[PDB]
Ligand binder design. Sequence first.
Ligand code: CL
Ligand code: CL
Lengths: 523, 499, 507
Amino acid sequence: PSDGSTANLVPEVNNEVMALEPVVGAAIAAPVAGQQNVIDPWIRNNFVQAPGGEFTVSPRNAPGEILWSAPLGPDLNPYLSHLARMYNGYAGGFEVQVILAGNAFTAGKIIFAAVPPNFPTEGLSPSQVTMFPHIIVDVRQLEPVLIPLPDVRNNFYHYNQSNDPTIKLIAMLYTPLRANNAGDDVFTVSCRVLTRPSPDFDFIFLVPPTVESRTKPFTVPILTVEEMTNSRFPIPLEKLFTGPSGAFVVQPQNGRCTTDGVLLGTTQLSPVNICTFRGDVTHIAGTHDYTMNLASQNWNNYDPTEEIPAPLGTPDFVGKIQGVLTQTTRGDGSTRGHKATVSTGSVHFTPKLGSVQFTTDTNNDLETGQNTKFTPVGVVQDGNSAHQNEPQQWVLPNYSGRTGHNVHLAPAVAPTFPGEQLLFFRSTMPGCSGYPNMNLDCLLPQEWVLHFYQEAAPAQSDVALLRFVNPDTGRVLFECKLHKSGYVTVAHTGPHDLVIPPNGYFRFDSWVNQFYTLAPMGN
Amino acid sequence: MALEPVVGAAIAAPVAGQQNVIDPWIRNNFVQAPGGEFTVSPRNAPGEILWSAPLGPDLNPYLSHLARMYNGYAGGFEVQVILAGNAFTAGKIIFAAVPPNFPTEGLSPSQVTMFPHIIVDVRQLEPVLIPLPDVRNNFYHYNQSNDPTIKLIAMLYTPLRAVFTVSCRVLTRPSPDFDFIFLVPPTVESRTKPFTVPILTVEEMTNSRFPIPLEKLFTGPSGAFVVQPQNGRCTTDGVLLGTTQLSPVNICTFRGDVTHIAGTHDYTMNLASQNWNNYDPTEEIPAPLGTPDFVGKIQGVLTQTTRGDGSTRGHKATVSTGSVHFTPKLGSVQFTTDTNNDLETGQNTKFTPVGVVQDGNSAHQNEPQQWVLPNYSGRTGHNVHLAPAVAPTFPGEQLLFFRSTMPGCSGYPNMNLDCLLPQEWVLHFYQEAAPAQSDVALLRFVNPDTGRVLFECKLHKSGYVTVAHTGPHDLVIPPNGYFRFDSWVNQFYTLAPMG
Amino acid sequence: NEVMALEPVVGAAIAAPVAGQQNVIDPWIRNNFVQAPGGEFTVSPRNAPGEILWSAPLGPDLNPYLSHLARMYNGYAGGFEVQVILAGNAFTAGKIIFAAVPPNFPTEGLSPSQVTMFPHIIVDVRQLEPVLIPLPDVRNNFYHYNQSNDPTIKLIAMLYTPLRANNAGDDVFTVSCRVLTRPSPDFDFIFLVPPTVESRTKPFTVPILTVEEMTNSRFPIPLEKLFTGPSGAFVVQPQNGRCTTDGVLLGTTQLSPVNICTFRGDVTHIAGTHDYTMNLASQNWNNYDPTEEIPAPLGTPDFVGKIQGVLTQTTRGDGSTRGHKATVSTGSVHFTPKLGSVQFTTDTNNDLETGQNTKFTPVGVVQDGNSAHQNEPQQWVLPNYSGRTGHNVHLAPAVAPTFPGEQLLFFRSTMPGCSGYPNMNLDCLLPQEWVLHFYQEAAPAQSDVALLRFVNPDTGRVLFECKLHKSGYVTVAHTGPHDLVIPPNGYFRFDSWVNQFYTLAPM
Ligand SMILES: [Cl-]
Ligand SMILES: [Cl-]
């Protein structure tokens, strides 16, 4: 029966069982629910992979790490997830199926535990997890693990739009992963979580779809790398790059946006205003320099009291940006345009205070009362100093110049998992003069900022697993982790420009946590 | 009583993959169809089909969302029609069920009575109920197929006597024999996502004909001009037209190798692709994607980088569209620069646009004519594979433009730049690829503070917007107002006056 | 566990009241599993979750017995039982999902999560016993017609968990899979009909001819060798020998293997030179119509170079005949065959009369010896068929491999040289006899790729396999330029239609 397959090398099934009493589903809610609803019985009789539903046990993982966790709710099941956008509430339990068919040469144990509502999960030790109803499963177990997840609660049913807690199911690494395959291979255990609603599960109230935030699902645009634009300078994207970031500090303030659509730093939605300035301009006596008193991006007065580091779209690197000042006179419509340059490392670059200084090609022909716009074009470098040294993309300017320090900054960004580096979306800035360092990396393409902003989809966990696919060949090129904080990471060591098919796109496959181990991409 | 009962999906059980159940409450409430708005106005005459819909999940917003989870369906509907008339209004509306594969084109009101029908007076208060059974000759219908179904049609049976527009609404609910058939994942390639319009504000969006933000909404008469832009031209279901591409930054830009013209400060650019590939002049496009779509002088900056040492050069430059040397369909355009030397020949060169200029000795505000197309192949022929021209077709209506102001670099230029669709709307339609359920998508502009509707407009499938107004007018809009897609309608819809 | 969540689906029994007749299939065919023609795929450690390793639609082409029978029947109805075999061992880990995708649902782009949402089975790489999958004929009509190509249910095989195994030495361990099929009891054919009349049932084939026995489709010369190479620098876009698998000719391609670089028409002298202008008439000697949706008259040369041959003329009344060494330059501005005129350089400025029909017989290519050696005949540069006065119109598409590790496979011949140092390499995408074969035997393509096997009949050994794309070009698994070392009697054999994800073994 098992001769030549598995070969008794492997635990077949688990004996342990969760010490939970039975718990009623939605039947209790019938006298006070608005309606008695029905779920397609095929959805109830068939396991499907949960959003989330992937996690890994690798040698990088350490005992105590929660490899997978989820609260009870419709988001446990993709069919129920889409249905839930059409209902106001729910009640009842789930059957979860976990697949752990590790290679026979692997060792290690996982604990699954049910933690009741309103108990804090945020510091649990392995000892402590044992005090809940729990099951301990060997990472090599062949038959899937079946865990019933009852809807422990103190009310008749749950509302989608509220934050009353539910039971949380936890999977934690109980014993580190060891292996004794003789060769130098990993044998990471790839695990799958599938679910189906219990018979007592039901939705409560029929309501207009998609208007409830907590049920909006997360997506990542189908756009190709060439079809998107840099979020730190109005340029198209060109390549994907990963490299080591230990030396310098990756802390941009443009193109910073969270997965559920909260903008951060100096980030705004318009991809054309990403290094623009608008306001009234003043000549500086005896020089070809002009001082600009800043208006907003929509030509309103600028309010420095706002909880932002600087006006939205203010450059987030130190360098000399060359462009054009343009001006129009209200009465007659006379227009003027002059070569201009802004140095963000200059002591007179104080956009938080409301003033920026340009160096122009005239000392007249710029009126003092007219609206003036700086259209950026490129970056420049002083040719007498070291080649490729002027534009430092990862050095933040002093938004208030010599007065005070920078405030309300978006956090810095770094890989936290062993073997991982940031993944940058790389664009090459036009050079106007000199020998400038023309590489510009952003953490998110501008179109992703647009998308996340509009679809304010709540993050089901802290990391969204993406796979990059070649649609011609159908093959996955690499996988990466998209963090809620709005940055991407990959499994690689060393600098590398990615070799990408022109048709490649990012495909969202599963929610994971920070302990997910990515397949190595490099070379 | 005029039709027999018609079985739904129960008959399909021996040949369907699965047996499914739909939430029975969905059939206990009449709900407005996604294309359940139509209008009767004195502009309409008998013979015009004022409203129509095919049987299918798209009749019901609940079934519409459910349909993303199923492969097919079978069964009928009960439809309810509501007419907002008054006692001073006269006329009759006939609703009729026309069976699959019968041609509606040319029907008289007399003939429409020969179908199962109801004749309802425009001044009735109480809603009228129509049964719509799933007459067919197969076991069931596939969502991904355009197989025909029974159609419900509404038209004026007697002429309307009454500015007074009669607002009408169509609501539906599934019959008890209706059911979905095969449970399937809601994928993107299904093209079952319903059509929407981005929530972005006019202020926060970008012009699709020049890399600048939008500023205001403008309506005006277009009898003088020929409205035929080639950028920002896109279909509601995501088909790009003309020279339109997706990058909001690469509009009115050029990339290629550059060559000096002896004795002048003028240069010739041999055009590479937007991706820096070779450019193929034989593509079925009027010109390379992002080519300027108006006649004028566009000033910017030419940029060049020498590979090997990192040498970079930048020079003020200017393109005159409609100049005889502007031939981007053939692969070359001519710039006038501020040097005759420093632009090297071997290296790749990029023109970054900034603004337009005007010769000050000529008539003021006459140089950039946004509604005059350049001759993409110069004198050596005329333009080909153009996106169609655009004009209002319904009496009382004008185009609605998304207006921004181009920066002026010198002179007295006409800085007015109107596009048909925001660039972000082009992006949205491309990615969502939502199939159009009719030829016109009715949009309403909403003030989110109060929930109030400020005006309505028609977004045509061809990718242009029209509104009910006469005369030029800059629209006065709350800065945070957004567009909302409300219903599929047809060409006979009468818009509320706006102004 | 191992059960696909599908309801039972009636086969041809439901069709009895509306079918004309009741038929019977040989019971041995019903009781014995047979390998689907493209029923092989492989699980390697390079594979990642979500990759579709194999797919097939339900239908008679999955079974060569049923495929042959369908040529004599009008329709069919019912399902199959599929047997899939996995060549694992106890020391492997990993999961494969098989899924039933309904008739009109697109497979293109599915994530692993979503594939789980179809009726499905999850199979462990260590499973020894074959997996039995019922594939029911989900449909919305009573039965299917052969000529109507109705869409059917699809079987999907996708990598669900990566393969975890040791390798032995440098040989990387892989799990080979095979897909076997046999008709369900409810499957049956419908109406007996004349056995080879119905078009959509003709099977695709490839000539048994040897490379030496075939002919180049771009110049009237025999083939000599098979050549594969990287093609990224240049643009592979020939206009002769371009034909689709189901027999539609493309570009300037025509059927006669001798008229591949010929010209016919009436000729006119250009005063003071040894040049002549030929007013072109159709290859069949008729009036020439430029309106034809073709790049140029059929058989017009599709490369830039100087072709030397012989002009021949015949006076109708007297019967006199004249023949003169001549040369055509396809890159010269006076080479405008789309407009109807071509310019020759001859060895006389006398003895070529007007109004008489004149035929250019091509012989070879020539090179200016004072220029760089091997620089004049650019085979992969198309001439400008309308000279300066416009662009080429209605071209056959350009051709490139899409799969990593794959390069074009060219049928290579060596052009005769007449003078100078010309590049005598000439590569075509299809032999002329393959064009002839596809055109006559107009077999419908069951997918975008026909898998071919190249066989040495002496030893019986297969030397390589290649992909014949429906568009009419071939690709192989190789990197770098290489002349193939082939036994002189080797032939191409058609094996199976496959899906676009089929990965072929390297040389
Ligand atoms: Cl989904
Ligand atoms: Cl209209």
